[PDB]
């Protein structure tokens, strides 16, 4: 997706605060802090559920072929996951 003022491919930022959406990863402006619009798009509305339930959260590959894709997973945090993986 891409913001409205600028037709520019959004940044996934996640949400670095305190509350019940701690972690939740949202599309975002990808110009500097300056000339940001305002946009902001929840990300997880189409993402996967893992095992317990809940939207998964993605993840992106950091050398080999399959460099560069992104996939999903549980989260919770390593001691609680549950097991779920799926490729984008
Ligand atoms: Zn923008
Ligand atoms: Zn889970």
């Not at 992106?60 to 609680?80: A, Q, R, S, W």
Request: overall charge positive.
């Amino acid at each position: 997706p891409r913001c409205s003022k600028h037709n520019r491919l959004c940044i996934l930022r996640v949400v670095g605060k305190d509350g019940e959406n701690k972690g939740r990863q949202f599309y975002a402006c990808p110009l500097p802090r300056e000339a940001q619009c305002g946009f902001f798009e929840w990300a997880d509305l189409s993402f996967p559920f893992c095992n317990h339930g809940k939207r998964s959260t993605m993840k992106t590959v950091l050398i080999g072929p399959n460099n560069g894709k992104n996939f999903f997973v549980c989260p919770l945090g390593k001691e609680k996951q549950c097991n779920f993986f799926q490729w984008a």
